[PDB]
Nucleic acid binder design. Structure first.
Lengths: 97, 93, 82, 323, 107, 110, 93, 82, 98
DNA sequence: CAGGCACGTGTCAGATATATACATCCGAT
DNA sequence: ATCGGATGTATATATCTGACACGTGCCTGGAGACTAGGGAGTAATCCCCTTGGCGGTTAAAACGCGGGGGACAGCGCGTACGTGCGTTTAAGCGGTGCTAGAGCTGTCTACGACCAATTGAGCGGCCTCGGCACCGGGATTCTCGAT
DNA sequence: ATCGAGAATCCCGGTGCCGAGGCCGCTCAATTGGTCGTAGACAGCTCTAGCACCGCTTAAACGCACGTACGCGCTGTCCCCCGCGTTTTAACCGCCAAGGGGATTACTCCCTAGTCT
């Protein structure tokens, strides 16, 4: 059986998910999550579809930027595996904590 | 040229909460700058809201929503409670 | 039916795809819970401002305009919608 | 000896009232005009007139300029202004004030001719004021006031003998003329703690005998209208006169009579005397004053002499109530 | 009462806040209740800052507020640190904070 | 009278509307009075910025072998330029994507 | 009602620069949002400058200073040059 | 006269004291040069805005108000000066 | 020969400079540097003393924050000595250079 | 418009802060 | 255990702040009913966009499992950075003198707000055909196990 | 240290599609032409403070010595995440109803403005 070496099937689809511009998160789970988060503030709230789409876009861009900074910190740490402490460091440096 | 400052009001508040202490001039200027910054922020947010909802005036709701937007949870709740009490007291008299 | 435990809707392959677009090579195992937590915090922060926006105008539907306003308030300025 | 000084100051506050809409001048200028009018000396300098404290430079400068030049350029410019003069002339009509005259001049209505031509733009009060513009501005001799007072009292006792009507004001004080009639009525069954048709009966009775010719406003407490004495079938008809009817409770009637009898200076002096004697006197009752200023329950009033005795002051006839 | 602040029971000026709202070209019409509400909010925030500073100032046997005490009060609190996270204070100094790794050997 | 009209944008030789800019400046409650030369200047600045960003977007679109500009081309043009990226550093573009960027360490050493 | 937008103006600018290119609806919306954002930033900075300098009006000088203070470097220089040329052309009538 | 070089006026002990206030123990040798560069570029960024503010007011003196406005423009609000 | 171990005389200075509020930068060299930077944008400029003091305050606070973030990055990298690449990473993540 | 008055600014007595001397008390060596 | 930096304790400056003194622009200056209209609060509709449900397909998610390459702990070292000391040199304080320009005030004067009257531009509706999405196969290229 | 098998991807061609762009019918905001109050441009005045210079004074900066300990290279252990295959599953698309909510009028109702003596 032909098996690719570990790492190649990562950089492949790194090229794919950086060349493409779809969502990469399913619509319905994110919609349900948004509704669950919203109902804690005011019960029985309605959401426009465009509002959920904008929330998804902004959140996904924020997550992409956070992962970029996490990868940068991991590379600085003499390492290629990103860890939660890298996310903590990036968030603390960015000023979110 | 008469400057515009919040000095006597800050001093009155300090006497109302800590009668036995004093405040230096540099701390007085820092408090004045802090008051000016908060006032500018709240007024700007209220103006943004009034322009946003197509309204042509600023009422107590605009300032209240600005306070709720800027200040964090406990501070926002206490500020809204204090301001609502003040508005009710002013209206009732 | 009040919603419950929908943060698990952000599946591990979705976080993996987001990280791949971010540009990481290999991903640890304990990172998914942290990613879900920070995602929940950010979503709560944005939606609280959006809900406060949509209540000052006496309305019950969260418009994308309110989401844009809330995002611009936090220093995001999302283009596109509106 | 300031006949010209007083007259020039008269209209200045009026433009402040009907055009500038500033009562905070009008009152000061009328106080200054009154204090100049009673000063028994011809003014030579504004600084001398400043001895009335409250002559801040603003009156002193105007009087000095008037003495030096015989006029005021501000006054001359405001006299020849078409808009200001039109507004001032329109405000002479009863019911036409600053806002009404300003709006009429804004839409071009500036003279009595336009006011007559625009009936549809006027309420009942303004139309009645327009109809009797000349009659309302005329002064009323005392003999005519005696005739119409006799007629009013006859009709009032005709309605019910228990009614009590008193014509207060300068006519009660014995003045030879008045600008309007203030008639005060009470009823024993009507007290502060007690009929909404008591005034209506009197109004209907006076309208039946054709004494009251018009109604400006009529409520359960006070009535505004017009009266005219009948001519003896051959003489010229008497001019229409403004008559006021006010219904007061019995426990407040004599206090109201004292208030509306005047004069204003006399009323102010009586209020000051009451205050220094530890009492407060108003249009409606008299109350004792506590050591801390808290007013107590109002004292019973059954006569004007009772009110004078409350403040330890000798009863004064209305003829002696000039000040 | 005579002054507008006395009617609302505040020490901050209703009139000055209203005048600033008019001149600041925030909106061409300002409601009557907005300046009172804003003055109350500003008064509460100033009282919070001052009481936290006093609870900090007092603790070093010092009975006079110093910019260092203001910085300590703002940084020590959590909500106020979030409110003023991007604000620097002249002569404010830094919180005493040494990382545990930086600390020397147990020995 | 009433000579034949010619919009102030055409007077200034601008594609952007200076009249709409003037109306927005007046009704946005920015200042008590608005000068006559400010709307023209602002419209010229806006037109220059739009022309530059559209030129880079069109170049990217033709590079990607397309005739029609899509948000991906706009994101590529914004991020590729140095000054424009600095101008819009805190702006997220809907359906924009991410510039291809792989760290040199992650590449296979072999 | 009526929703105003910079669609026709952006289209004219695109045709004036690239005669043989099109544009999608979402790209047009993004361009419109960018135009509104930049206009809002420049107008706010000009208003802030006018308030700081105790002035009551905003002129070409205020907008020029705001443009020089917002846009970075050569972009700001070229924007100032283009705006000055446009103002000269307009005042030439 | 004309100031030739003054970035060397930010001496090594000054950088060391600033870093100690930051909370470090050991400092490398290139930290001084890197910090001088960063301080120079930050001062250039602030001074450009301050000078623009001064020029707009037709003044030849850069006051503290211009400096605090320039600092507030970048989000680094400064208290105690105006 | 009383010599302290390397590191103790670091914390003895850390607590002092964290407990104090002095500017830690000599005033005249900073003023000369500010004038040298300012003369590149407009010749013949004069500065108020308060403006120079505010500039010093802002630069000092910014450098202190940058050094704090550098220290955090250095400790994250399993190290106690800060290096210029740590400052590079801190500025990069903060969003300043790019 | 004329008063009434809360702030703005200036001045000096003095609580409060700071610096300066010695006796204990605690991390490196 | 000794000894240089942290602690207290007492004292002597010293100094910057709070209680008076005087001026100066803000700040608010009668009331009691009787007309007359206004934003809006609720009653009453009109689409219609979002909510909810049910069923059918299937791309995607969850789960198992064999590695193999990366995370990580331990060792050795050598050189880069710490602390200390004598010396210099430039910061800092205190005068001394000078004038460039910040701040304020008076005078108009062009400039922008504001209001009829007019009309051409941009928005809404309604086609329509072509750039592009999608699918399929061939050609080209990238990757890993051995010869 | 390339051949070759195996897999992934680009290219060419064919087909259909739905929305980008153009045209028409407008409504109303942009434009012209006037008036009129005033924001500030331009001169004149102070007089504050920033700049230049000099003379001590000494504390910080610096060059150099010397020890030592920490970053970095290296090596060996092991463990856990990735590539691949197999088995669910709920995401998504298709249709339906439906129902309350944003956008309208519409009567009136307490609130606010005018007035007046």
């Amino acid at each position: 059986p032909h098996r690719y070496r570990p790492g190649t099937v990562a950089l492949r689809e790194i090229r794919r998910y950086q060349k493409s511009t779809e969502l990469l998160i399913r619509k319905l789970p994110f919609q349900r999550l948004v509704r669950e988060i919203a109902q804690d503030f005011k019960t029985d709230l309605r959401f426009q579809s465009s509002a959920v789409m904008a929330l998804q876009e902004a959140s996904e861009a924020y997550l992409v930027g956070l992962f970029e900074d996490t990868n940068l910190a991991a590379i600085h740490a003499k390492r290629v595996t990103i860890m939660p402490k890298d996310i903590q460091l990036a968030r603390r440096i960015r000023g979110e904590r | 040229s008469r400057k515009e400052s919040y000095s006597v009001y800050v001093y009155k508040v300090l006497k109302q909460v800590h009668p036995d202490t004093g405040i230096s001039s540099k701390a007085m200027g820092i408090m004045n700058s802090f008051v000016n910054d908060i006032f500018e922020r709240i007024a700007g947010e209220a103006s943004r809201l009034a322009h946003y909802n197509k309204r042509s005036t600023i009422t107590s709701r605009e300032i209240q929503t600005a306070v709720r937007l800027l200040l964090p949870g406990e501070l926002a709740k206490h500020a809204v409670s204090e301001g609502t009490k003040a508005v009710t007291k002013y209206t009732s008299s | 039916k009040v919603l419950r435990d929908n943060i698990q809707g952000i599946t591990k392959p979705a976080i993996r795809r987001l990280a791949r677009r971010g540009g990481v090579k290999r991903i640890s195992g304990l990172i998914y819970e942290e990613t879900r937590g920070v995602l929940k915090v950010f979503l709560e922060n944005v939606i609280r401002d959006a809900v406060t926006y949509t209540e000052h105008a006496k309305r019950k539907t969260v418009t994308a305009m309110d989401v844009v306003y809330a995002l611009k308030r936090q220093g995001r300025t999302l283009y596109g919608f509106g | 000896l300031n006949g010209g000084i007083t007259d020039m100051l008269t209209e200045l506050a009026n433009f402040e009232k009907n055009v500038s809409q500033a009562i905070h001048k009008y009152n000061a200028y009328r106080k200054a005009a009154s204090v100049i009018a009673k000063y028994p000396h011809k003014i030579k300098s504004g600084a001398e007139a400043k001895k009335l404290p409250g002559v801040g430079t603003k009156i002193a400068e105007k009087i000095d300029e008037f003495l030096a030049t015989g006029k005021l350029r501000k006054l001359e410019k405001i006299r020849q202004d078409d808009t200001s003069s039109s507004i001032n002339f329109l405000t002479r009509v009863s019911g036409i004030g600053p806002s009404a005259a300003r709006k009429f001049v804004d839409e071009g209505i500036k003279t009595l001719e336009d006011l007559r031509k625009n009936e549809d733009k006027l309420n009942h009060h303004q139309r009645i004021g327009l109809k009797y513009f000349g009659d309302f501005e005329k002064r009323i001799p005392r003999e005519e006031m005696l005739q119409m007072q006799d007629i009013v009292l006859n009709e009032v006792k005709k309605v019910d003998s228990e009614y009590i009507a008193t014509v207060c004001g300068s006519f009660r004080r014995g003045a030879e003329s008045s600008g309007d009639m203030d008639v005060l009525l009470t009823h024993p069954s009507f007290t502060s703690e007690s009929q909404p048709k008591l005034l209506h009966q009197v109004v209907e009775q006076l309208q039946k005998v054709h004494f009251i010719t018009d109604t400006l406003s009529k409520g359960e407490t006070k009535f505004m209208g017009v009266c005219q004495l009948p001519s003896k079938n051959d003489e010229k008809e008497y001019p229409h006169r403004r008559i006021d009817i006010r219904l007061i409770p019995k426990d407040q009637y004599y206090c109201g009579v004292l208030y509306f009898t005047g004069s204003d200076i006399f009323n102010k002096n009586m209020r000051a005397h009451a205050l220094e004697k530890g009492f407060t006197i108003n249009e409606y009752t008299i109350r004792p004053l506590g050591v801390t200023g808290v007013a107590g329950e109002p004292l019973p009033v059954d006569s004007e002499k009772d009110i004078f005795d409350y403040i330890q002051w000798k009863y004064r006839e209305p003829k002696d109530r000039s000040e | 009462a005579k002054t507008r602040s006395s009617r609302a029971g505040l020490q901050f000026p209703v009139g000055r806040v209203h005048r600033l709202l008019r001149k600041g070209n925030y909106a061409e019409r300002v409601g009557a209740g907005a300046p009172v509400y804003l003055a109350a909010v500003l008064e509460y925030l100033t009282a919070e800052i001052l009481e936290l500073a006093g609870n900090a100032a007092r603790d070093n046997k010092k009975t006079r507020i110093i910019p260092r005490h203001l910085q300590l009060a703002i940084r020590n609190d959590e909500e106020l640190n979030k409110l003023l996270g991007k604000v620097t204070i002249a002569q404010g100094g830094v919180l005493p904070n040494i990382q545990a790794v930086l600390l020397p050997k147990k020995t």
